[PDB]
Nucleic acid binder design. Sequence first.
DNA 1: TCGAGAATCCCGGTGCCGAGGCCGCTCAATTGGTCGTAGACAGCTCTAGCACCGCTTAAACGCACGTACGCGCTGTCCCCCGCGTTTTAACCGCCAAGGGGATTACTCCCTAGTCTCCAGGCACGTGTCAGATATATACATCCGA
DNA 2: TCGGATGTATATATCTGACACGTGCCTGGAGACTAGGGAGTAATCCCCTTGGCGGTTAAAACGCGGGGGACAGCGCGTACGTGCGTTTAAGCGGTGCTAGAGCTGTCTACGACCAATTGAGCGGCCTCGGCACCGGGATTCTCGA
Lengths: 94, 94, 98, 97, 81, 85, 109, 109, 358
Amino acid sequence: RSRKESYSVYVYKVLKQVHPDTGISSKAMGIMNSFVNDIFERIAGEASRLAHYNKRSTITSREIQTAVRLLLPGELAKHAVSEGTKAVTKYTSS
Amino acid sequence: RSRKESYSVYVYKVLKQVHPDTGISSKAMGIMNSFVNDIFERIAGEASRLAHYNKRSTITSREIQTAVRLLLPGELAKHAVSEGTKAVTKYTSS
Amino acid sequence: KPHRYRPGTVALREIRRYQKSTELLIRKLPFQRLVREIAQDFKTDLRFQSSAVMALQEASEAYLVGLFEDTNLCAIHAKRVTIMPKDIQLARRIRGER
Amino acid sequence: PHRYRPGTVALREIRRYQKSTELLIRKLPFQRLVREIAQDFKTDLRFQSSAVMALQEASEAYLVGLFEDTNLCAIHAKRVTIMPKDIQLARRIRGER
Amino acid sequence: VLRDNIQGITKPAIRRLARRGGVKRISGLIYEETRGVLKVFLENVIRDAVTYTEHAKRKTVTAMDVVYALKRQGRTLYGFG
Amino acid sequence: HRKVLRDNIQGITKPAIRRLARRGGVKRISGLIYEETRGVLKVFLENVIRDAVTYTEHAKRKTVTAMDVVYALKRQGRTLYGFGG
Amino acid sequence: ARAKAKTRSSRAGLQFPVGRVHRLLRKGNYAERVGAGAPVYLAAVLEYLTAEILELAGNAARDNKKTRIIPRHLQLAIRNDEELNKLLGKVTIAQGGVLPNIQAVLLPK
Amino acid sequence: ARAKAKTRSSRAGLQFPVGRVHRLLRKGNYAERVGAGAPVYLAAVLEYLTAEILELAGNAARDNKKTRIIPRHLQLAIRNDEELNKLLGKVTIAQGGVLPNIQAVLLPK
Amino acid sequence: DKLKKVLDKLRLKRKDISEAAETVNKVVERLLRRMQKRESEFKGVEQLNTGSYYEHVKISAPNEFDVMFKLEVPRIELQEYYETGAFYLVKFKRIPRGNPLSHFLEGEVLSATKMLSKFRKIIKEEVKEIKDIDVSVEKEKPGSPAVTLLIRNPEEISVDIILALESKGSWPISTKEGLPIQGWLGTKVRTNLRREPFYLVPKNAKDGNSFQGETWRLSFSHTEKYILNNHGIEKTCCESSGAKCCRKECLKLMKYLLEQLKKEFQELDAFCSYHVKTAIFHMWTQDPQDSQWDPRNLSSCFDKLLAFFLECLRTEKLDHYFIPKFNLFSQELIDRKSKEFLSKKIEYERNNGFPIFD
DNA sequence: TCGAGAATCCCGGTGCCGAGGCCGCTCAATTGGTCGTAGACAGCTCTAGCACCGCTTAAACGCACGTACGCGCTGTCCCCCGCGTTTTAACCGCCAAGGGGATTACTCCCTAGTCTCCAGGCACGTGTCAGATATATACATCCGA
DNA sequence: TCGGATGTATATATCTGACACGTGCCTGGAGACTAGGGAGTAATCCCCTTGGCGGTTAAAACGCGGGGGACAGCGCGTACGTGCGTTTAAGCGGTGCTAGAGCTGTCTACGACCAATTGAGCGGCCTCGGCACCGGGATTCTCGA
Ligand SMILES: [Zn+2]
């Protein structure tokens, strides 16, 4: 039997940090799964088009940062950019 | 000096078969060039997404045919499909 | 003498009730029959998974509700409270669907 | 004196301007406006000319479309003039606010 | 075969759909137009879904097909796959 | 001569708005359309130019080439034909 | 001994190139491997559409006694049809003008 | 002797996986070669956005005394904001309902 | 001389035909009104004016007339039939609304048989309603596409009605080198003429059963009329403030010569006035100057035309003026022995003072 | 400004079925090296954007007049709401049959990758014809009497 | 209904610059060949779609009386169209500078690829408590006198 992959466990883990006693019904799991897939698709597609305009042939962090700066409206851009930079720095340090 | 590629000559050739005595000004050449690029982009992108939904990994004529059947509205679909099939048959015969 | 609300009150009570629930508002079986009828014209002997019919129903409900919101705006714009077909046709024309 | 009745020169001007194809906004004021707006996002920017032309063409097309839809609302509400309520309604229906 | 099913969208159903929208006094000529608009919308979506299924060489229009047909026209639907 | 600028939105004169309206097929323009039109134009221009400048900044340049503006427009469903592509 | 070169556009009886389209398909990251029948089909479709636009524009240009084609004629050709206008319902054409149109109520009695 | 395994999500201090995102990027035909820094950034952004939605929905759910989360709460959380409502301005949520809203002129005098 | 007397007689002939021509125009105009009132697919039909004077019309008996009814059709496609483009096939391109002629199709091609059948039927119905003048429709003649009216008021007049399609598209590519008057009337006039529609008239080829009733030939009656009436390098040529030439007089003399020979010798059945008009078009191109056509020198100009025609006879080659590859003097259209016969007749007439004009 | 009534909120008790956790286990992620190219960086050239000056004149600005349209007020009558009673078909529960989706094996031919070689297409230069412009008409349209 | 006034379409004559066409050359497309993995085809399993029966009560359908909202008509006033006279600054032609876009040439580091190993996550169970539903009471909001 072929057997599939989703984002249920990760979303549940993230939920258990900002509301330590609530649950979530399977319909909401489906909605959150689809939402994650859609955002990932949009960001990756934008990054690909950017990398192709400048005749480059690779995806560095910088294209992802510019794509995020283009899609998310308003102050969400600032906050997400800061989060990404902090994470990548903490990863490269070790 | 780097030196670029366009669709000027081909559009001019096609024009010389349906109006054997008219010309075309450079602005119209720019417009037709951009239009060809845009249609090619739309059709190729649709074909790629189709080939990826079914877990395939290649682009045959059949995906291009389905993409054309999806984009072009109305009877344009019928006429373009017939043209494509005739051309591919005449090519495969030899 | 029997008790009777003046015209224009049960309307607001029902607006307040319906804007608050979530279940569907179109009977299942008639919609299933309509979908099969329409699909008859493009191919013969098709089979629909149930969830597909559910998806079609949800999409249609959402589209119609949006259309009526915009129509109501157009109607109130012209010193009225009653919607008429010219309002719907104007809304669809402006929105770019025609 | 040969005054035309009100509502004639307007129809003549429609019949003329719906036929030509040049640009209707003066150039230098638009260039100055574009640079003024651009200064906030980044300082000391240099524009090619064709970029300014492209911006102008897009702006003209957008405004013309908006006025057409506004006129449609104004006729629908039993009038002939257009007033800001019309424009706000059109932009709210199109989904931009 | 089937015939005369568009009359399945009754008049009270349209009244309820309007009430959810925020309308107070519906006239008497709305129904004959709402039915037509709904018919057009369903025709478009179902045509795209059937094209997808025909391409994939199947006889069962699955939910993913309808979701893709909807997403094509810019009406994304979250909650089925 | 890096002279900053101020109050150039008044440069979109009144007859320009009038002519733009006439091309659209209108017949009587009230006296308060002008402010609304200027506001709308300002909003639209801001939205386009922000994305154009981001596209430029990504490539380490100081010249906002027209092809960038074409991309910025295309991203909002306003594809423009006639300026390179 | 190699046989004489014979371009693929010749063997297909088309006008748009086929080698160029094949290269663009391969180096654009659309799929891992491009079949050998796709480019012919795609070139045929593109040629047909360009033929449509050019023929209609040429008719409209000969209408008012002009030899060449200028963007106004392209806008006139596109905006009058019923399908082409639906395929290009979002596209602005530089220096295109608009269609002559005056509402019915504005005209004087 | 091989050192003990240590997942990349651990070394980055995230929650969403990074290996899975890297695989999806490589086998989706987005570009020829994916740098080694992209997946971390992308996972961080996704985690932040999901955190936003879940926190707002949780507040709205605790509002009316319910332990779990159901699609109505997600619709309430999304439709009230000013930026999230603009990022998802085209998306229909199944079984979502609408926002309570009655116009001002309909209400009786 | 005899030639001027012949011209006088030819001119005096218009009086004997004028009243019949007027009755014909009356009937035709009634028919056109009838066809335009009724709701059918032929509602837009109109008369094409092709000229009624002796110079414009084909050789005919004095009480026989021909008229062309033109019809409008959207966006046709022409497929060549021969190598010279003597015949054309008609097909249809994309139409958004739907082809109003859909039910006249046979496969991909428009069937001339069906269109003429409906045309004839409609004509019969409308002609039955003409009550004041006895007009009926002659029994269809197999092999002739015309619908022939018989008018009895009280003498019998025949009117062949030929349906003609009209197309506003580009002129066919074959005609690219046609109309070579760039040096005769200037380039701008050539362009203005080429910016006009063209006509298609049904004609079967003589090439077997296949495609019979599905072939059409081109008609340029409008350009030829225009050139005939505006034929000078000087704008005032043959005008009230200009000078006459003998171009049309020469045309009339040669046409009447051919008419009389064809009457005397039925061996000459395959020759027609179009050969004469083509020849004289070539002469008008070769000798563009009005002074090369002074009326004083009419007979000499006619003789120089005769010599060219004899050489045309001898080489069996006469290119269509609009379609250069279309050889009007091909072996298949006119037997070599008929041309040798005509050569002998022409030499006889030229050496004996044209007794056939007597 | 008040009674009377009808609809909604609050609340206490019961039953169940769906969310939450546990246990195998297997297949994808990690660790460890190798290498061949793409991107980084320095250095140079030359196009194109910016800044300035004088002027010729087309478009913008400002003011007066008055006419047509926006807006408010009244009257009227017919269409849509609210409610009661009857009639129809949606729903739910339970079977029963079988077309078709999904998975496994295997084998072959179509596409990727290389190497060579030669012509199609691009940069450049040139000469003349189509279109822009100026001027004088000839005709179509609006407005008061 | 008409004549006068104004505005627009037409024909003629003249310049000028851009486009249609040659020309030389170069690099990428075609020809010939080889290898191997994706996809096509056949066979088997089982699940989930269609089809039907039968009872139950919720909702649709029909009809009736009347309060109120759409619509037409009228009257009034200000505000925006039209035209004339005046003042501002936009094009435009032409210099003159130099910042930076774009290109060429080395050279290092890093992502793909391959091979072995092992633990995170998925599918399949169980289990109990969060919620739906019932039924009774209290609260509140609308209408007529
Ligand atoms: Zn003459």
